[PDB]
Design a protein around this ligand. Sequence first.
Ligand code: HEM
Length: 370
Amino acid sequence: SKEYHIDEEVGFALPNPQENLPDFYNDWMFIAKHLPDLIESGQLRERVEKLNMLSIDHLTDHKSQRLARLVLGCITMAYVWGKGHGDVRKVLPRNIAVPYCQLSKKLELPPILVYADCVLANWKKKDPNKPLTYENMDVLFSFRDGDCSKGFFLVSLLVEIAAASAIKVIPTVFKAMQMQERDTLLKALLEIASCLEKALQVFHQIHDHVNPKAFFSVLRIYLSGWKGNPQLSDGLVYEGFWEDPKEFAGGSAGQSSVFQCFDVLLGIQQTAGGGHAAQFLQDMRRYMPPAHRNFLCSLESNPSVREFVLSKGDAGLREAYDACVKALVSLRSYHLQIVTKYILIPASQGTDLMNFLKTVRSTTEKSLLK
Ligand code: HEM
């Protein structure tokens, strides 16, 4: 692990993310930092339009570029949707479009706000000597006041941090299988299940910080996109970069690499009963960071953990492997409960979504050995 950008402490999340772009981009930053004020007043769309075109050239390191994708990204979402009641912009101004697209090309993500932007790179610690807890963290950018962006973004991040405890054990799994050290392998699988159980309890926290009405009626809007959206049927026009409107999905609440990570480790094959499900999971990889998709691919290139357990007849190991599979099923199940609370109940003012989630979970539980 090194080419793949996975931190021992925070995993798929960006470690110690940059808070400030070069001053050359002060204009970008000003708008992104005032989205709450500037959206509520309707001054956002105007100011995005009075903006000069700045080169991406002074954004030299990875973090600077990731922060740009984040600021230019929020600005874009706020610009397209405005206050959220019909007045949509179908064309993004060149001066913000071309940099956003050029930066996206370099960083290999679609030009639309993505989970790697608004959750993984979107945090700082208040006090750096205190730990990584909600009471000691904060986000870099929010959209509108009372949008519960802090809660959703941070509680999501803290799950990613929790999951780092299980991801760090992955090399140990493979080393044990290579040097045929069966007890080290057994503790390893056992620690992964456990870390995933802590991961689950962390996910309980979402209720303490995210209000269902606020989420659905406010924040979900700036997270929403333009693939199959009746509001932007033909996509979005990135002025000056493509002449034709292009479609990209707004999927930030479903773009984490953590479930597919342990899909891949345990050799859970997500097509065994899945006409559409596999395509959808594979589309989600395209909205993950390139290193993170490279990682998942690299993982499948390792010798199968599952094949190894099934080829020993060791009851302790099967029991341990199942513990991990059970843990992934508990995450995906709790997750469903969250979608029911934060999407289904509020949408009562969809079911083809639920079955997709349900399909993905069942093949997972079906991948058990006992
Ligand atoms: C309010 C909180 C959440 C909501 C409303 C939510 C909603 C959704 C939705 C609607 C999808 C599938 C379709 C789409 O992309 O729009 C999805 C899938 C997914 N969500 Fe969430 N999610 C939430 C929290 C989380 C958290 C904290 C994580 C992980 C840190 C997560 C991980 C995933 C993953 C990995 C998928 C892909 C399906 C899979 O691999 O099983 N979600 N979620």
